[PDB]
Design a protein around this nucleic acid. Structure first.
Length: 76
RNA sequence: GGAUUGAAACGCCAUGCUCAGGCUGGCGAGUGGGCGCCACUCUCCA
């Protein structure tokens, strides 16, 4: 694995003075090694329902979105 | 169309199982033993 994220660049300076940009993986402390303990065989059934929020407009209805969800889930 | 302690994340670069050595020297298959005793092609038609 990697040790750090990419910083924000400045476009205008980039072509106002042409320079290369990159992150070099292989160099020194950049390289990081991480282990993982994980599950192997899973299966779940989850019960959840629906609710409108304050941002919602007056035309919104929970039932319509629920039906859309059902259609999509059936179709895959 | 904001958000799964999430969104990104190589085990990588390369290294002879090698040099060499006899299965060799030599030893008899050999001494000697009867295929023997005896048996009708024979009785007819110019």
């Amino acid at each position: 694995e990697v040790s750090s994220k990419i910083p924000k660049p400045n476009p205008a300076t980039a072509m106002r003075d042409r320079k290369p940009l990159y992150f070099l993986v292989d160099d020194g402390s950049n390289r990081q090694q991480r282990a993982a303990t994980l599950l192997r065989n899973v299966d779940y059934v989850i019960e959840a329902h629906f609710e409108l929020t304050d941002k919602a407009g007056a035309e919104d209805n929970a039932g319509k979105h629920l039906d859309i969800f059902r259609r999509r889930a059936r179709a895959g």
